[PDB]
Design an enzyme around this catalytic site. Structure first.
Site, mmCIF file in Angstrom:
data_model
loop_
_atom_site.group_PDB
_atom_site.id
_atom_site.type_symbol
_atom_site.label_atom_id
_atom_site.label_comp_id
_atom_site.label_asym_id
_atom_site.label_seq_id
_atom_site.Cartn_x
_atom_site.Cartn_y
_atom_site.Cartn_z
ATOM 1 N N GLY A 43 0.809 -1.207 0.000
ATOM 2 C CA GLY A 43 0.000 0.000 0.000
ATOM 3 C C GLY A 43 0.842 1.255 0.000
ATOM 4 O O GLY A 43 2.072 1.192 0.121
ATOM 5 N N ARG A 44 0.166 2.402 -0.146
ATOM 6 C CA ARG A 44 0.782 3.724 -0.162
ATOM 7 C C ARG A 44 0.149 4.610 0.903
ATOM 8 O O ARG A 44 -1.039 4.481 1.213
ATOM 9 C CB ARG A 44 0.598 4.402 -1.536
ATOM 10 C CG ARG A 44 1.452 3.843 -2.665
ATOM 11 C CD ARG A 44 1.106 4.540 -3.969
ATOM 12 N NE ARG A 44 1.214 3.641 -5.119
ATOM 13 C CZ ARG A 44 0.605 3.832 -6.287
ATOM 14 N NH1 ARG A 44 -0.172 4.893 -6.473
ATOM 15 N NH2 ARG A 44 0.762 2.961 -7.274
ATOM 16 N N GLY A 45 0.963 5.512 1.427
ATOM 17 C CA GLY A 45 0.578 6.553 2.371
ATOM 18 C C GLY A 45 0.852 7.907 1.741
ATOM 19 O O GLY A 45 1.434 7.969 0.649
ATOM 20 N N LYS A 46 0.444 9.005 2.419
ATOM 21 C CA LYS A 46 0.645 10.374 1.922
ATOM 22 C C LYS A 46 2.130 10.678 1.678
ATOM 23 O O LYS A 46 2.467 11.286 0.658
ATOM 24 C CB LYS A 46 -0.022 11.421 2.837
ATOM 25 C CG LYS A 46 -1.550 11.321 2.853
ATOM 26 C CD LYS A 46 -2.235 12.612 3.297
ATOM 27 C CE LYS A 46 -3.738 12.520 3.147
ATOM 28 N NZ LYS A 46 -4.400 13.843 3.301
ATOM 29 N N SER A 48 4.603 7.879 2.356
ATOM 30 C CA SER A 48 5.248 6.570 2.488
ATOM 31 C C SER A 48 4.725 5.527 1.493
ATOM 32 O O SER A 48 3.663 5.702 0.896
ATOM 33 C CB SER A 48 5.125 6.046 3.921
ATOM 34 O OG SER A 48 3.804 5.636 4.239
ATOM 35 N N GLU A 49 5.499 4.449 1.310
ATOM 36 C CA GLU A 49 5.150 3.291 0.486
ATOM 37 C C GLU A 49 5.568 2.089 1.302
ATOM 38 O O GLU A 49 6.704 2.047 1.789
ATOM 39 C CB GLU A 49 5.866 3.297 -0.874
ATOM 40 C CG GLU A 49 5.288 4.279 -1.875
ATOM 41 C CD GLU A 49 5.452 3.880 -3.329
ATOM 42 O OE1 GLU A 49 6.518 3.331 -3.695
ATOM 43 O OE2 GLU A 49 4.503 4.122 -4.109
ATOM 44 N N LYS A 65 8.867 0.108 5.116
ATOM 45 C CA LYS A 65 8.154 1.354 4.889
ATOM 46 C C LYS A 65 9.183 2.355 4.388
ATOM 47 O O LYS A 65 10.107 2.725 5.131
ATOM 48 C CB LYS A 65 7.496 1.832 6.193
ATOM 49 C CG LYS A 65 6.760 3.155 6.090
ATOM 50 C CD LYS A 65 6.579 3.693 7.517
ATOM 51 C CE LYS A 65 5.524 4.740 7.646
ATOM 52 N NZ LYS A 65 5.134 4.886 9.079
ATOM 53 N N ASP A 149 -3.192 9.313 15.690
ATOM 54 C CA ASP A 149 -3.731 8.878 14.404
ATOM 55 C C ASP A 149 -4.376 7.491 14.535
ATOM 56 O O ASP A 149 -4.256 6.634 13.656
ATOM 57 C CB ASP A 149 -2.702 8.998 13.272
ATOM 58 C CG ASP A 149 -3.265 8.904 11.879
ATOM 59 O OD1 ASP A 149 -4.455 9.261 11.690
ATOM 60 O OD2 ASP A 149 -2.514 8.489 10.969
#
Ligand code: AQT
Ligand code: AQT
Lengths: 320, 326
Positions: A43-46, A48-49, A65, A149
């Site tokens: 998956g991907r983050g704002k 991060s990958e 990460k 979060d």
């Protein structure tokens, strides 16, 4: 505004040497990413990958990460917190800190977690996993850290092994009494009233509000529970359930100035009963204990919310 | 001619990386403004450098500024590229900035601050545990830089900074470091006399990371035996004779024969014949508290003429001498 402090773990960082909480001064030792072979993107983050990877030295799967180094200070913060919490109950385990020799892109290596997607979930299952999150929260709060979060995306579960991990400590911060924090944290649906009204002196109790939002979505099968379309609207969604009377009592208690953007959208709303959200599809997950526990989590006044330790002693958990 | 040789570990790490990583000649250096740094005091002077303590005026933090005498531009690009590649590695001096003074235009490297303890006085207070602890810290730096395809080539006490109060160690001065490429023939005029490996002394150019392991061995021997330096040559030819007075001339011939090395005729009249000495011979009242069977077994496995037989940094970290360290 009126100052405020945490009811629990107030001075845990104050009584610790600067090396524990001064992440800016922390020296990061970036190892060689050659010990890890990337397998696939998860998956991907704002910023991060996340990848599944194999540690070639011991043939163990890990999660890598890769961080987009947008803010160096934030990377140091996440690393320091992960190092401090490393090995704590239900906390994602930082295994290594590496950089690819060519890219030099920062990368965090964690313990592998066989994440189940998720339907067949029982009343007991919700109590069980909620207690597991509370263990992580009481632990990180006791270590003077606010996650900031808490949401389903940041909770990984391996239902086969009844294993749960609280992940993505990228927004986490050290709690210092009287510190004024940035309110641009957490994800919209889980933002506490304090963030939306721009009350900066918040504490661990913010995570308890977020946990309450998760609980409400599960037992009522309404995801998300408070469905704001923007940060201003998010407070209105909360007010449509909690009422506007208690919102004014909250802002008056802390002498908070309400942004004028609320003027035309807030309106007037009654305090709703939790029983109203009970329906045929969700009644098997709802109980007086669950509603009493939920009511003690979703409170405007951050000081009145149950602490993670108080929450663990609630009758809703008597069966776990 | 001589028999070719390659590293037993990290052999092809640069071969499998794009040229960007190891082609330092093609590396583009971005020289920032040195006006952000105020020089405080001189710490020491190198053959082509001067190292200063400085203050970063933008954040009131102390830094270390190494001002390079631009004698060889290619060498400056090499050092910068290696420091950039290793930036952040365990126990490696951290390059923070690259600057030039607006007027002087002299190349300058800016590093993380290191609180260097004067060991000339604390040499007497060291314990067996302290030597094992700091030796393990150097091995972390070496296994890391070797894994990154870099040979330091100037491992010596002068290039190891220690903040004893914080048990912090840094491997510095990467000015002689080079990228390892299997089969590459290197300049043997590297390292500092006392720490030169026999490969350099017999002009065997195809050396590798193992050179740093010989140098580490010289440091270990000088510390545990309190004999500084351990191999006290007066010139590069004499340096090999001082090693032969310890390791013996039989094993030196086995080494040169294995690699078909031609011994310089300058060795003819000075080498002589020497027996292989037992390491216990160097134990005395002043150093016995630093020596142990484990220490001498470890030393014996570093100080070998044959560069391929020496422990790699990773093998060295698993030796019983380190069983007592974290
Ligand atoms: C049953 C417990 C429960 C009680 C109350 C409310 C919700 C839930 C719940 C429901 C579902 C999930 C699962 N969340 C998945 C987390 C997740 N992010 C990921 C990110 C990834 O890459 C970036 C990869 C896998 C990932 N996987 C977690 C939880 Cl805690
Ligand atoms: C117990 C540690 C140890 C174990 C085994 C063998 C040797 C040593 C050792 C002993 C002492 C030192 C300290 N050397 C400081 C070197 C140093 N460069 C400098 C350069 C400077 O200007 C260029 C100024 C000060 C400097 N100061 C380092 C080491 Cl690695």
């Amino acid at each position: 505004p009126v100052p405020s402090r945490a009811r629990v773990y107030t001075d845990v960082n104050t009584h610790r040497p600067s090396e524990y909480w001064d992440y800016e001064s922390h020296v990061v030792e970036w190892g060689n990413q050659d010990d890890y072979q990337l397998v696939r993107k998860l998956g991907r983050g704002k910023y991060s990958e996340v990848f599944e990877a194999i540690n070639i030295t011991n043939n163990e799967k890990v999660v890598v990460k890769i961080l987009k180094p947008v803010k160096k200070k934030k990377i140091k913060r996440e690393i320091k917190i992960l190092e401090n919490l490393r090995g704590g109950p239900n906390i994602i385990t930082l295994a290594d800190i590496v950089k690819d020799p060519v890219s030099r892109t920062p990368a965090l290596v964690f313990e592998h977690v066989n994440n189940t997607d998720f339907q067949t979930l029982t009343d007991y299952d919700i109590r069980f996993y909620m207690y597991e999150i509370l263990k992580a929260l009481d632990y990180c709060h006791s270590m003077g850290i606010m996650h900031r979060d808490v949401k389903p995306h940041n909770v990984m579960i391996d239902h086969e092994h009844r294993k749960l991990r609280l992940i993505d400590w990228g927004l986490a911060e050290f709690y210092h009494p009287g510190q004024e924090y940035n309110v641009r944290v957490a994800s919209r649906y889980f933002k506490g009233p304090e963030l939306l009204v721009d009350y900066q002196m918040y504490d661990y109790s913010l995570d308890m509000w977020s946990l309450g939002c998760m609980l409400a979505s599960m037992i009522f099968r309404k995801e998300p529970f408070f469905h704001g379309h923007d940060n201003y609207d998010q407070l209105v969604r909360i007010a449509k359930v909690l009422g506007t009377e208690d919102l004014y009592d909250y802002i008056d208690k802390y002498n908070i100035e309400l942004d004028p953007r609320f003027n035309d959208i807030l309106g007037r709303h009654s305090r709703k009963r939790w029983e109203r959200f009970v329906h045929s599809e969700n009644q098997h997950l709802v109980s007086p204990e669950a509603l009493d526990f939920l009511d003690k989590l979703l409170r405007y006044d951050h000081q009145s919310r149950l602490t993670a330790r108080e929450a663990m002693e609630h009758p809703y958990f008597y069966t776990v």
